[PDB]
Amino acid sequence: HTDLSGKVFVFPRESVTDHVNLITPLEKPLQNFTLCFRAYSDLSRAYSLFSYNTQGRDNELLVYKERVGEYSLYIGRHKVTSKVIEKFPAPVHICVSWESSSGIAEFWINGTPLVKKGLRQGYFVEAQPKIVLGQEQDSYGGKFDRSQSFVGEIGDLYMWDSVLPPENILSAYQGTPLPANILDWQALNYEIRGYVIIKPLVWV
Amino acid sequence: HTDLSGKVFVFPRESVTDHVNLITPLEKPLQNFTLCFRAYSDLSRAYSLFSYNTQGRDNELLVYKERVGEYSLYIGRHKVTSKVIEKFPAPVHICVSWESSSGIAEFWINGTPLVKKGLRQGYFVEAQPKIVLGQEQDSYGGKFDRSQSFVGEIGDLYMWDSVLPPENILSAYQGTPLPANILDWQALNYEIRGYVIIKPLVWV
Amino acid sequence: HTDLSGKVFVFPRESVTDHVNLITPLEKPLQNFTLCFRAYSDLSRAYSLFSYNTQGRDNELLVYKERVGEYSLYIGRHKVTSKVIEKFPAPVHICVSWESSSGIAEFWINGTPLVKKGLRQGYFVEAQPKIVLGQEQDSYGGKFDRSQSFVGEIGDLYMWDSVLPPENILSAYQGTPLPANILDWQALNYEIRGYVIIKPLVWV
Amino acid sequence: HTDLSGKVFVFPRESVTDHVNLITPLEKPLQNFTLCFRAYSDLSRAYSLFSYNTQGRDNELLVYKERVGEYSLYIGRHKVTSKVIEKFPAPVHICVSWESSSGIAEFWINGTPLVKKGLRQGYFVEAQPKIVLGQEQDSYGGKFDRSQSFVGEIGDLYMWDSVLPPENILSAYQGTPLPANILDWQALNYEIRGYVIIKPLVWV
Amino acid sequence: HTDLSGKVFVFPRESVTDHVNLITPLEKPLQNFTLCFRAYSDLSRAYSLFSYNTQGRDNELLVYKERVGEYSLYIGRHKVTSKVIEKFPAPVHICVSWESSSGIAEFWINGTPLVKKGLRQGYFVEAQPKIVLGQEQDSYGGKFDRSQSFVGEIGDLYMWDSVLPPENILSAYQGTPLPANILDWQALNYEIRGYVIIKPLVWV
Ligand SMILES: CO[C@@H]1O[C@@H]2CO[C@@](C)(C(=O)O)O[C@@H]2[C@H](O)[C@H]1O
Ligand SMILES: CO[C@@H]1O[C@@H]2CO[C@@](C)(C(=O)O)O[C@@H]2[C@H](O)[C@H]1O
Ligand SMILES: CO[C@@H]1O[C@@H]2CO[C@@](C)(C(=O)O)O[C@@H]2[C@H](O)[C@H]1O
Ligand SMILES: CO[C@@H]1O[C@@H]2CO[C@@](C)(C(=O)O)O[C@@H]2[C@H](O)[C@H]1O
Ligand SMILES: [Ca+2]
Numbered sequence A, B, C, D, E: 001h002t003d004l005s006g007k008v009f010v011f012p013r014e015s016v017t018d019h020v021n022l023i024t025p026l027e028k029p030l031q032n033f034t035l036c037f038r039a040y041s042d043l044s045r046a047y048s049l050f051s052y053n054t055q056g057r058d059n060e061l062l063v064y065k066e067r068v069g070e071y072s073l074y075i076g077r078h079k080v081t082s083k084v085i086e087k088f089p090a091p092v093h094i095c096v097s098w099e100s101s102s103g104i105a106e107f108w109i110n111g112t113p114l115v116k117k118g119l120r121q122g123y124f125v126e127a128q129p130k131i132v133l134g135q136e137q138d139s140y141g142g143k144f145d146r147s148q149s150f151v152g153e154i155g156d157l158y159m160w161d162s163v164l165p166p167e168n169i170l171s172a173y174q175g176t177p178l179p180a181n182i183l184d185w186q187a188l189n190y191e192i193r194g195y196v197i198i199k200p201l202v203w204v
């Protein structure tokens, strides 16, 4: 594990090969979660932000950007889309949460709450995942698409096993998040597979 | 009755089923009224905000959003439309009032007064209603349309039997309204019929 | 005569009947004038603001709005048009002045001076008029058109027999005008003929 | 020899008649100049702002507005254009300087410097001119057009036989200029031909 | 060498002839660099900013503007493009850096960092160059193109043999840069070949 504080993963070109694999010891399936990160891209096409696929289970947990202003969350093949007013090109802090009991999906872009949507109530997002950044998975760890690739900079990635209250999301936005148990940017276990460079975070 | 202070009804998807019925003991017909609420939607199509229908009397009292900036009030099949400058998508506080004697309809969007229009002078809006949120009624409690459905978040619903002065509308906007006698968000008698979740109000 | 201070005439619908006649005991013809008022409409089509017609003399003195930003003054069948940057929909304070000696027409929208235009130098605008608001006249007191009708709110109407200096126009804009001799909103002699309601001025 | 300070020339209509001739004792040809004025027009089409024509030479010195955000300078029939961000309709202060040794043309719009352009290096702009305002000349003091005429207001017109530094430019924009040797608004010899009125400067 | 402190090179027209050659004693090839300058143009088409070509090696180091908001860097025939929000027309301060080890290219427009891109990792940009401003080279010192020509003003050109930290880029933006070893605007060795004039920098 590495402390990636004040650092970023830079995906410098468009490809179907460059990605980062993220290792987490997930034995038990997800009921509740929150996922916070910082992203900087000048791409006007659609791309993947966070791709989580389980064994023969595609789009199990996917954070997808459709176009400028439109954000999508996939929970088990099913999607949900919410809109926001944003500047293109500009740095963005994204927080996304989901809860099984209600089926509610919360998106927070730049510490601002988007309209709540719901999908897959009573569902459990499966354990033992292949988590990739920079690429969208269409299988367990592979089957990438160049048109869905992320070219840009990714930082401040934290994932919790609970639904974070408004105060804690703003603490993450302000750059002082609470301890994260699934993924922590301060104790990150990663794997770089192609052309992905670690550089200091200069845009916050 | 429930106190729904600091809470919201979230209509998480588009359907022709999900709605909330609101129960009020209306014996005598309406001459004067004010109706205040908070709404948050990222829908660019037309939808209903407040649907009140009486026994064989469709669009008796309807608050309808046409498109971005355009708001409509229906008093007994007859409509009236007023315009405003607004951001899409964004949280909105709506106040609408009507008076029988003059026929005047006042709309206040974000504590800002819109151009006064008039309809149905000398009319009485009938008692014993079926009041639904999330859906538009084309009968007494039913006959819904998916294209007119509200997907989003509704909060701070208050209804009075009088025409509220400018000072009181701003008190409602500021989040400290005067006692409401038809409907009160602090003592709400409701019925949830499908997929509608109660969550905290995070957008004020 | 009535004191209409802090009040407005509300033309609540589109029609070819609803209007207000304004009575003024002048029958000496006009050389110089200033005309100040407040208007609030969400109409995107063309309409009349002030219609003054004399015996067999149409468009003798007409304040006409063409579209958003464009204002027209008619002095004896002859028109003059000036442009401005304005928000739609929004409250507006209009001042218009004309002088016979030079032929100069001054328009002041929200206390801001527009480009000076000239028409009908050496002309006298005739006495004994039929002054209507809410409708455009095509005869002496009648011959209205629904497409030229004003639906909205009119307030703070004052008319003087002189060309007002910049300081006095701003005093009118600020809501403290100097004594008016043709028409005074503090001592108004009017006639309502259809559906026109008096309500308090809530938009200043 | 008239003090026109706090006053403006108004060209009230579109014609092929109305112009103001400006007289100056210039006997020697110009190698260096600076020309300062204020203009207010709501014309969308192309127009002449300042026309200087000598015996046998059309477009000797011409300040021409092409469209919104586009200013042109003609030196001895040769053209140069510069772009700017500006609001339509708006009052403008224009500063144009030219130097023969370098060929450099310097435009200043509302105290902001434009991209320097070059034309006619080594040229001497001919003496004994016919200087007109409101119209574009095709001959010595005549041969006008209706489509290039100025409808609007001109004020604060000064002309120097030197290239003025940034500080002097800015003081002219502030409304505290340096005394001018070719044309001075505070001691001007002019000639009104047709319908052109002198009214006070109410704008900037 | 000359002190060009508070001065600018003005390329006053479009041509295929006017350019400035910049002489630097480069014996050894470039691994790392930073290149800072100020540019002012009202051209809406594509142009070259900095052209560096080596012996039979076109687009070895090229700073190219595609359109408004889009900036390109060429390292050995290979390009990289990044986007920004900018006003047209407006003065701009550009900083561009490249590092061989990582292949990372950093663009800073008005002291604001753009999205990092990568190209040509492990490459060395060759020595003994022909460096031209105002024109794009398609050979060693020549083969220009009218459509790729820069018309405008260039200033504050500094080039270093290292990748400059964020603090130093802002020092360059603020107008107080650290000592430059490849090119220094304080001690510039240049050659003017056509119509290019030296004038004071009035736009900072
Ligand atoms: C959204 O419409 C379609 O959805 C499928 C499934 O979901 C993703 C993100 C994917 O997994 O590749 O895209 C697929 C396809 O390319 C899109 O046209
Ligand atoms: C507005 O034009 C039409 O009005 C009718 C009656 O009113 C509502 C709101 C309704 O009750 O369903 O819509 C109906 C229809 O779908 C619209 O095209
Ligand atoms: C402006 O063009 C035309 O002018 C005439 C005369 O003037 C008014 C305002 C009027 O008196 O009805 O409109 C008339 C007509 O409808 C317009 O198309
Ligand atoms: C970008 O597409 C093409 O690239 C080549 C190579 O690179 C430059 C800048 C050049 O060296 O002239 O332009 C060339 C051409 O004109 C462009 O259409
Ligand atoms: Ca997939």
Ligand SMILES: [Ca+2]
Binding pocket: A136, A137, A138, A143, A144, A145, A148
């Ligand atoms: Ca895919």
Ligand SMILES: [Ca+2]
Binding pocket: B058, B059, B136, B137, B138, B139
């Ligand atoms: Ca209905």
Ligand SMILES: [Ca+2]
Binding pocket: B136, B137, B138, B143, B144, B145, B148
């Ligand atoms: Ca319906």
Ligand SMILES: [Ca+2]
Binding pocket: C058, C059, C136, C137, C138, C139
């Ligand atoms: Ca008429």
Ligand SMILES: [Ca+2]
Binding pocket: C136, C137, C138, C143, C144, C145, C148
């Ligand atoms: Ca008419």
Ligand SMILES: [Ca+2]
Binding pocket: D058, D059, D136, D137, D138, D139
């Ligand atoms: Ca000419």
Ligand SMILES: [Ca+2]
Binding pocket: E058, E059, E136, E137, E138, E139
């Ligand atoms: Ca080239």
Ligand SMILES: [Ca+2]
Binding pocket: E136, E137, E138, E143, E144, E145, E148
């Ligand atoms: Ca080329």
